[PDB]
Design a protein around this ligand. Structure first.
Ligand code: HEM
Ligand code: HEM
Ligand code: HEM
Ligand code: HEM
Lengths: 146, 142, 142, 146
């Protein structure tokens, strides 16, 4: 797995400043709102016939953070992300039967929520860095869809 | 968008091949979960999921019905297909990414089964109609 | 296809944001050449496809320039963008791939420029809208 | 990725009974028509006005045959694919200006044109192996686009 060194730092800088309590909920909210099919694994968590509710649904806040903390575990093991996520990857499939394209949508909403926070700090360079990381981890989590 | 020619294309082709659409939907369905097991998240409710599966035999039937329908609504797929939409979109929350795959397989079962009729011309036209269908199927999403 | 919800939110947003259109395209076009190097393929003849080169700059005028256009022609983009669907097809034969690329990059820029306005709700509609825009540019491909 | 023996097997077989000089043109011909933006990279050809021209064009057959041979290297070195297509990428990249998306397109057509050629003996299981191998080649083929 190739990682230039600027890349390393960027994903390090990014994962240092980022408010997992803010972001996380916001990013799962937008993906449930922007890609309402992904809601099939967060249905009965409250009136999903609502943005404002979804936004402010507890259930949803929580898993979003798990998501971000979960991405943390790969921010350390930057050279073996697969083995890292293989469990989680073997989980989301056999356990909750999740559509691994969904992992695509959510990363995007993350990358887009993240953007709104760094604002003008989120450089093109910063976007690539952040985005290729997200990509890499994404094969990882759909890996054991078998 | 579909042209007069494309529409003729896909209606010619459906005329020659439609006789075996049951036949066509079993394997195209067979191939989707084999070649793309990730799509099994869905039919994992099924008592039987391997090709050979009478559940699969039976459902492939359905999907080409649906594609019989869509050929009959080709001038207005969005309207023709709204009940199918809301099912796959509202109820079944399928991901639109998955429509691309069964069409791929539909594209490939047809070529095996109707090599000489599946012209490159026939193809570019059925392919547009298939996304065309994917688009109609996705009306009820967001 | 765009509801009136959608057309409603697309316009308000762009009514809100549409005055930065020249900066949004530079930034967004810079992102594209930067994060998705393969897109540079379409700028080989360009004296130098550096980031945010003025030629790049100016060109983001045009790009974003086409978005405003798509705004007003929102009620029907097929008719609305055929000149651009002609340029970006028979002339440039641009792979439909990169439209979604650009489209994603545009949502990121706007996101950075207008976190207050770019609500979720104003994202799905602007999302669905760009896709229709993506699809109307494809109109003259095949 | 890894390869079962069967995958190894199925793939060896496919390319061996394949008729390199016949499915080549057919699949590349078929791509240009179904995905006409891929005629981009086939400028000076002389008569590609309508489809039937494309088909009856010498400079499409060549490459279309060119292309099947180039996978022999990947059938040959199943597990050094990446390294294997290294110079081929950079070629298509910095000189041929081939859009990477173009690769999956041609993949998809090689498959359809082969499935016609193979009929019932293009089992689902054969398709899995064929597409997985073509994938790995596609990815690698868009790998040095900087
Ligand atoms: C970057 C991608 C993702 C990562 C790293 C990730 C990470 C995690 C983590 C750390 C857990 C907690 C495990 C547990 O509590 O037992 C989890 C559970 C779960 N994930 Fe995600 N997730 C991702 C994307 C998704 C997506 C897109 C979906 C589909 C909506 C999803 C569905 C679930 C579900 C339903 C659970 C069960 C929660 C539980 O019972 O604890 N995940 N995931
Ligand atoms: C070519 C596009 C498609 C067509 C024409 C189509 C057609 C159909 C039809 C006719 C039904 C029967 C349900 C009813 O009306 O009672 C159905 C159900 C269903 N479809 Fe599809 N479909 C398409 C794409 C997909 C895809 C890509 C998936 C998932 C990978 C999917 C998943 C399902 C499921 C899970 C059911 C329910 C089966 C049951 O009743 O147990 N559909 N579809
Ligand atoms: C939102 C979608 C897009 C819009 C509204 C748009 C708009 C435009 C406009 C208005 C022009 C010509 C202006 C003039 O000369 O008066 C143009 C030309 C061009 N566009 Fe775009 N475009 C879009 C997508 C793309 C994408 C995704 C690419 C690259 C992958 C691209 C590459 C080009 C190229 C190569 C030209 C011709 C001149 C040149 O770049 O050398 N366009 N486009
Ligand atoms: C399986 C995918 C492909 C493989 C293995 C492949 C392989 C090759 C090889 C080894 C060459 C020799 C260099 C040469 O002829 O100068 C070549 C030529 C070339 N290829 Fe590809 N190619 C593939 C896909 C494509 C696609 C999708 C396009 C564009 C639609 C493309 C465009 C070209 C062009 C323009 C040439 C130059 C031929 C010449 O100037 O004589 N290739 N290809």
């Amino acid at each position: 797995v190739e990682w230039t060194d600027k890349e390393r730092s960027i994903i390090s800088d990014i994962f240092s400043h980022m408010d997992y309590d803010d972001i996380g909920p916001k990013a799962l909210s937008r993906c449930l709102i922007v890609y309402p099919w992904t809601q099939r694994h967060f249905s009965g968590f409250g009136n999903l016939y609502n943005a404002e509710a979804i936004i402010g649904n507890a259930n949803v806040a929580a898993h979003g953070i798990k998501v971000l903390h979960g991405l943390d575990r790969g921010v350390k093991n930057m050279d073996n992300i697969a083995a890292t996520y293989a469990d989680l990857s073997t989980l989301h499939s056999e356990k909750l039967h999740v559509d691994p394209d969904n992992f695509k949508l959510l990363s995007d909403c993350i990358t887009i929520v993240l953007a709104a926070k760094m604002g003008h700090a989120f450089t093109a360079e910063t976007q690539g860095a952040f985005q290729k990381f997200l990509a890499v981890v994404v094969s990882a989590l759909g890996k054991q869809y078998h | 968008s579909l042209s007069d020619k494309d529409k003729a294309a896909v209606r010619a082709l459906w005329s020659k091949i439609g006789k075996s659409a049951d036949a066509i939907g079993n394997d195209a369905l067979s191939r989707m979960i084999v070649v793309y097991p990730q799509t099994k998240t869905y039919f994992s409710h099924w008592p039987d999921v391997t090709p050979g599966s009478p559940h699969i035999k039976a459902h492939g039937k359905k999907v080409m019905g649906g594609i019989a329908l869509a050929v009959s609504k080709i001038d207005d797929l969005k309207t023709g297909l709204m009940e199918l939409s809301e099912q796959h979109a509202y109820k079944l929350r399928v991901d639109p990414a998955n429509f691309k795959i069964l069409n791929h397989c539909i594209l490939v079962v047809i070529s095996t089964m109707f090599p000489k009729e599946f012209t490159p011309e026939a193809h570019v036209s059925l392919d547009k109609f298939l996304s065309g269908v994917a688009l109609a199927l996705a009306e009820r999403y967001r």
